[PDB]
Design a protein around this ligand. Structure first.
Ligand SMILES: *[C@@H]1O[C@H](CO)[C@@H](O[C@@H]2O[C@H](CO)[C@@H](O[C@@H]3O[C@H](CO)[C@@H](O)[C@H](O[C@H]4O[C@H](CO)[C@@H](O)[C@H](O)[C@@H]4O)[C@@H]3O)[C@H](O)[C@H]2NC(C)=O)[C@H](O)[C@H]1NC(C)=O
Ligand SMILES: *[C@@H]1O[C@H](CO)[C@@H](O[C@@H]2O[C@H](CO)[C@@H](O)[C@H](O)[C@H]2NC(C)=O)[C@H](O)[C@H]1NC(C)=O
Ligand SMILES: *[C@@H]1O[C@H](CO)[C@@H](O)[C@H](O)[C@H]1NC(C)=O
Ligand SMILES: *[C@@H]1O[C@H](CO)[C@@H](O)[C@H](O)[C@H]1NC(C)=O
Ligand SMILES: *[C@@H]1O[C@H](CO)[C@@H](O)[C@H](O)[C@H]1NC(C)=O
Ligand SMILES: *[C@@H]1O[C@H](CO)[C@@H](O)[C@H](O)[C@H]1NC(C)=O
Ligand SMILES: *[C@@H]1O[C@H](CO)[C@@H](O)[C@H](O)[C@H]1NC(C)=O
Ligand SMILES: *[C@@H]1O[C@H](CO)[C@@H](O)[C@H](O)[C@H]1NC(C)=O
Ligand SMILES: *[C@@H]1O[C@H](CO)[C@@H](O)[C@H](O)[C@H]1NC(C)=O
Ligand SMILES: *[C@@H]1O[C@H](CO)[C@@H](O)[C@H](O)[C@H]1NC(C)=O
Lengths: 226, 294, 327, 98, 142
């Protein structure tokens, strides 16, 4: 390595808990260092996995550590047509993250308050609502769905379950029987695709368009199109 | 024979440890169930308290291709009483020994015409001090041309003698008398270095690894960390200029008087070549199981 | 030739009705947020859009098949779950104590790998799916609650106790289960008399068969092997993406940051181009592979719907459609 | 510009289909860096300037392993007529560690 | 161009195999519940399928299924079988229907609608005496 003005806040203990960039004298990368009980060869000092990803490191102090990555959250969007209603979701995360630690390009403004916690993580752009929808069109995963108003935030309803009419488990010789007292005709429209549009194609007009040097050059491939 | 199911003498990965997992590894290995190139040393002739004429083999007239380097199993015969080579009826306690290796690329015939005279600039490793020191170099050997001397008359082979009534006392070591013993047959010129290394003494099995690579000559020993197991980790990387192609053993005997002779261990030599293994590293990072492909 | 003794065969069958929904960004895996990488990704461009459209449509079709089957298998009317059901029939595996006991003895014995559906980031902060950018993709949460598939199976358990006496889905007739079993045995050609004096005997044989399939949760079950096969198929599919970051396709290394650290722009353009071409081809193969898996799962979902309608919601007369022998 | 920009670009339309769509996620900024490892003494370069540079069939190597280097003391005093680097950038060779 | 041709050929052979199998499916579906009434649960229509009609489509066959869909289900008092006090052996069971204690006496209804009607021979069959039946004396059905 070259001569280096060594910095005090570049020890592993100096930057515990916040994921940073390790440069171990030609072994570079980024990730989060965590305290670990000593595993593997002390003298090798470097351990990878079957996928050749570095897992742990024996620090010079005498303490062993592990690392995965600078992990952050996946980001997804929900949006409804004809009501310009959008919202952002972060998967399986605590509502930790605001507009501070960014990458790629900028965000979209919103007119609020910020986060809300859900079983799939965090959501910006919704609010609690105790309604239940069976026929949601844009399900936000697990059992939550946003109903836009019939224009601001949507209604973060839960996916309703069509709980059927429970019946009583009578144990005597008599019986409680369910019976329909009204009916309707349902016109279920089905369709089966049977035969696709029959197509053919010429070799030489498609590939060659009637040009002579092309026409001799086609036969070297030739039989493929046949 | 070497067994990989028993995981005997497999070199560790150079810098990449693992844990509790298996992985393919292309690298330098010996085969499965090899007979090897096992040799064994012995003491010279003696009557009562007389250091007499030596007792060695014709290893100097013999040579083999260096190939891809090799390994030596050391101490496989110790901890027990075994036969005496010079006195086949007599059996004594087996004490392990550490042999000396000379290596190069240009070989000629000796002064008596027997093939084996190495030419120009060659490397010798030599254990000394009754197994304590590991003096190694890559310099210019010169044979002696006197009586029973490699460039001189009445010469069959050469050996480094060991005087155990003097050398193997407590401390002492006669200032590396086996290097003197080699120097009683040779001398040294145009010397790059004279490299010094220490080791302790034991009656536990061990291995040693030699290989050549473009950066230098890699020397592997498990005595540094894995005394109780045994698998090859680098300690030395010698700055060689070119790639060697011949190896041979310097013969070595012991000036052991007949009244107090000692039996010695049979070290094993196994060549290595590129193959591919599968390795099952445990949680410790130690090699306890591997498997061949060929 | 007439049978004179008998038993109950607990045949175990499984249908992979729905592969696990997978969503991946091309830009993250191909590029990992490097500026010159993003610059070079522009020319191939719409390849990302085609990949995203294909995977999104495959996921959507999977969800639509899920919705169609679950609405279809939804009994319009059912019964709740009480202890003492089956009475004589020791059916303790069936009863959900927020999930079912037999579901636990299945799922726990399934070699699973660390979901982390809320504390996955916290699992990475603790000490497979903790790989998220290392995995490079988002695991889509399932379309229902686990509580909701439990509710679906609960509705089914309530349904089967009553549907199997009358043809037609018009009404519901949730008779006590023992009489239902007796009438179903009367259907397949067993007289009411031998039922009348051997209720306890057939009950004990039923309980023994249920214990045997219960205690048999090991390699002896080919259905156990096949559900582990489906799990391993998912594992291999994800590991295909995971291990292909190591592939350089001829490049000097895989660490793109090291690639731009060491090499000049004009040649690393070609190197990155080789890398991204290999990556896009692998994602194309991945998309086609889950497309085949998706249509397979759609047909399998249809078949499972037919089986749960015919030989589950009724006692089918098809010769060994879902019961080895007779059902 | 925003999420809707890439959403519209993914369908070749101003009028898109509504729905929960995966978008290109962003990355938290780095928290700093750590450079920690034991470093040995500098490997000197004076034998290169000591003695005659040998013949082309006799060129003398200099091995460097586990050492340090300050390139500022040698290249400014070399009257270089040709500085090339194959398979690597000629400027940043002194930068990276090997 | 030829690689695009090969991909198109592969895609269209995949589509052709799909078209052949789905054509077999459509042939089956117009066989079972169209030329007859497939009693299987929801092959071509949810609930119980009643009727269907078939029209063309520029790449397939388009189906309309009119099916039964019930509502306003209520709870009633029902049973299995009635056996005489003097003749406990002779018992009857409903055929595609139920015995309902009407809220007008036991009566018959069908299995598809709340349609109470006086029980006769035509809608029931003579069956064996099982236990857990009902055993009336004041008005025996014919
Ligand atoms: C030859 O003589 C030597 C004495 O010079 C004699 O050595 C003894 O060997 C036993 C057996 O290995 C040693 O007992 C060890 O004790 C340590 C704790 O101090 C344990 O950790 C050892 O376990 C190792 O071996 C296991 C497999 O056997 C591994 O799985 C495990 O992970 C450990 O690596 C082991 O119990 C004893 O300490 C030495 N004694 C001395 C003084 O060195 C040896 O047995 C004699 N025979 C042979 C054939 O070598
Ligand atoms: C090393 O790998 C083995 C192999 O999987 C692990 O041992 C298994 O542990 C599970 C957990 O209870 C058991 O169900 C298996 O029966 C074990 N198998 C074997 C062969 O031991 C072991 O836990 C791993 N150790 C570490 C430290 O990761
Ligand atoms: C890591 O945890 C171990 C176990 O408690 C502890 O002994 C060690 O001191 C910790 N590391 C540091 C740097 O404190
Ligand atoms: C919504 O409010 C109800 C009651 O106020 C509460 O039980 C529920 O947890 C809330 N949900 C969210 C997401 O805040
Ligand atoms: C059934 O419902 C329809 C509309 O809901 C109604 O017009 C009709 O009168 C109802 N019939 C009965 C018998 O309730
Ligand atoms: C090798 O040794 C021989 C012995 O005579 C000598 O002639 C030759 O010059 C030596 N080679 C080199 C490169 O010194
Ligand atoms: C040994 O070194 C000296 C001084 O460099 C030189 O003159 C002599 O020729 C060398 N001898 C051999 C055999 O290389
Ligand atoms: C029927 O066979 C099983 C096992 O072969 C046996 O346990 C049982 O007692 C048999 N039953 C009769 C009635 O023979
Ligand atoms: C029913 O099976 C469960 C499952 O092991 C068992 O714990 C229980 O004792 C059984 N009860 C009877 C009555 O067989
Ligand atoms: C009354 O009903 C019970 C229950 O099935 C039956 O055992 C008994 O024979 C019936 N009594 C008469 C007189 O039919």
């Amino acid at each position: 390595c070259p001569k280096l003005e060594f910095a005090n806040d570049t020890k592993i203990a100096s930057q515990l808990g916040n994921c940073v960039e390790y440069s171990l004298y030609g072994v570079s990368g980024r990730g989060v260092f965590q305290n670990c009980t000593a595993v593997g060869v002390r003298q090798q000092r470097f351990v990878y996995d079957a996928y050749q990803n570095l897992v742990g490191y024996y620090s010079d102090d005498g303490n062993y550590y592990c690392l995965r990555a600078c992990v952050s959250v996946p980001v997804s969007v929900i949006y409804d047509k004809e009501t310009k209603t959008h919202a952002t979701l972060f998967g399986s995360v605590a509502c930790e993250h605001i507009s501070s630690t960014m990458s790629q390009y900028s965000r979209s403004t919103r007119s609020m308050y910020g986060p809300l916690q859900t079983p799939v993580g965090c959501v910006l752009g919704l609010v609690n609502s105790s309604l239940f929808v069976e026929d949601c069109k844009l399900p936000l995963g697990q059992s939550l769905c946003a109903l836009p108003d019939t224009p601001g935030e949507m209604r973060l309803a839960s996916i309703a379950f069509n709980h059927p009419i429970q019946v009583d488990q009578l144990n005597s010789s008599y019986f409680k029987l369910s019976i329909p007292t009204n009916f309707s005709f349902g016109v279920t429209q089905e369709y089966i695709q049977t035969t696709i549009q029959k197509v053919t194609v010429d070799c030489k007009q498609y590939v060659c368009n009637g040009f002579q040097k092309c026409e001799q050059l086609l036969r070297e491939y030739g039989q493929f199109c046949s | 024979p070497i067994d990989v199911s028993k995981a005997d003498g497999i070199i560790y990965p150079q810098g990449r440890t693992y844990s509790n997992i298996t992985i393919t590894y292309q690298g330098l290995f010996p085969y499965q169930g090899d007979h090897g190139d096992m040799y064994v040393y012995s003491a010279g002739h003696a009557t009562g308290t007389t250091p007499q004429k030596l007792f060695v083999a014709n290893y100097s007239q013999d040579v083999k291709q260096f190939a891809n380097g090799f390994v030596v199993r050391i101490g496989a015969a110790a901890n027990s009483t075994g036969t005496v080579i010079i006195s086949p009826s007599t059996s004594a306690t087996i004490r392990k020994i550490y042999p000396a290796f000379m290596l190069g690329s240009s070989v000629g015939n000796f002064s008596d015409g027997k093939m084996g005279r190495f030419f120009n600039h060659t490397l010798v490793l030599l254990p000394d001090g009754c197994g304590t020191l590991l003096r190694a170099f890559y310099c210019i050997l010169e044979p002696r041309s006197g009586n029973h001397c490699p460039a001189g008359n009445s010469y069959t082979s050469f050996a480094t003698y060991h005087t155990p009534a003097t050398d193997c006392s407590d401390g002492n070591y006669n200032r590396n008398a086996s290097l003197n013993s080699f120097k009683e047959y040779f001398n040294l010129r145009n010397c790059t270095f004279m490299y010094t290394y220490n080791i302790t003494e034991d009656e536990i099995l061990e291995w040693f690894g030699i290989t050549q690579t473009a950066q230098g000559v890699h020397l592997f020993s498990s005595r540094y960390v894995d005394l109780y197991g045994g698998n090859m980790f680098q300690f030395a990387t010698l700055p060689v200029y070119d790639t060697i192609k011949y190896y041979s053993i310097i013969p070595h005997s012991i000036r052991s008087i007949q009244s107090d002779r000692k039996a010695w261990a049979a070290f094993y030599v196994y060549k290595l070549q590129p193959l591919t293994f599968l390795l099952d590293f445990s949680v410790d990072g130690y090699i306890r199981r591997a498997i061949d492909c060929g | 030739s007439i049978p004179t003794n008998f038993s109950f065969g607990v045949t175990q069958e499984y249908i992979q009705t729905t592969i696990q929904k997978v969503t991946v960004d091309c830009k993250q895996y191909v590029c990992n947020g490097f500026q010159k990488c993003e610059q070079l990704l522009r020319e191939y461009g719409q390849f990302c859009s085609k990949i995203n459209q294909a995977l999104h449509g495959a996921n959507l079709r999977q969800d639509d098949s899920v919705r169609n089957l679950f609405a279809s298998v939804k009994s319009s009317q059912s019964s709740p779950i009480i202890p003492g059901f089956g009475g004589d029939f020791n059916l303790t595996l069936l009863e959900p104590v927020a999930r079912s006991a037999i579901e636990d003895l299945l799922f726990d014995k399934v070699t699973i790998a660390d979901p982390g559906y809320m504390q996955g980031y916290d699992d990475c902060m603790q000490q497979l799916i903790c790989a998220q950018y290392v995995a490079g993709y988002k695991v889509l949460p399932p379309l229902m609650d686990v509580n909701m598939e439990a509710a679906y199976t609960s509705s089914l358990l309530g349904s089967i106790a009553g549907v199997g006496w009358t043809a037609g889905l018009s009404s519901f007739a949730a008779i006590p289960f023992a009489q239902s079993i007796f009438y179903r045995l009367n259907g397949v050609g067993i007289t009411q008399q031998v039922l009348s004096e051997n209720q306890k005997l057939i009950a004990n044989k039923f309980n023994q068969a249920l214990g045997a399939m219960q205690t048999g949760f090991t390699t002896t079950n080919e259905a156990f092997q096949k559900v582990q096969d489906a799990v391993n198929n998912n594992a291999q599919a994800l590991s295909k993406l995971a291990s292909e970051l190591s592939n350089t396709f001829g490049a000097i290394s895989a660490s793109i940051g090291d690639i731009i650290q060491r090499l000049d722009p004009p040649e690393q353009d070609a190197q990155i181009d080789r890398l991204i071409n290999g990556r896009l081809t692998t994602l194309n193969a991945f998309v086609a592979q889950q497309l085949v898996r998706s249509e397979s799962a759609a047909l399998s979902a249809q078949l499972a719907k037919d089986k749960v309608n015919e030989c589950v919601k009724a006692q089918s007369k098809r010769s060994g459609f879902c019961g080895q022998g007779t059902h | 510009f925003n999420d809707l920009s890439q959403l519209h670009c993914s369908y070749e339309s101003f009028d898109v289909e509504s729905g929960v769509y995966s978008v290109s996620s962003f990355e938290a900024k780095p928290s700093g860096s750590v450079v920690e490892q034991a470093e040995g003494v500098e490997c000197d370069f004076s034998p290169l300037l000591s003695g005659t540079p040998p013949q082309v069939y006799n060129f003398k190597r200099l091995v460097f392993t586990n050492c340090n280097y300050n390139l500022t003391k040698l290249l400014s005093l070399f009257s270089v007529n040709d500085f090339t680097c194959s398979q690597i950038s000629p400027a940043a060779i002194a930068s990276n560690c090997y | 161009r030829l690689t695009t041709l090969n991909a198109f050929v592969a895609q269209q052979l995949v589509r052709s195999e799909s078209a052949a199998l789905s054509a077999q499916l459509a042939k089956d579906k117009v066989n079972e519940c169209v030329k007859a009434q497939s009693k299987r649960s929801g092959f071509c229509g949810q609930g119980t399928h009643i009727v269907s009609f078939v029209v063309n489509a520029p790449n397939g066959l388009y189906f309309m299924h009119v099916g039964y869909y019930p509502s306003n289900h209520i709870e009633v008092v029902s049973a299995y079988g009635l056996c005489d006090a003097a003749n406990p052996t002779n018992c009857i069971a409903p055929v595609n229907g139920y015995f309902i204690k009407t809220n007008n006496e036991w009566s018959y209804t069908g299995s598809s609608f709340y349609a109470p009607e006086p029980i006769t021979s035509l809608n029931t069959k003579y069956v064996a005496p099982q236990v857990t039946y009902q055993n009336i004396s004041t008005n025996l059905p014919p």
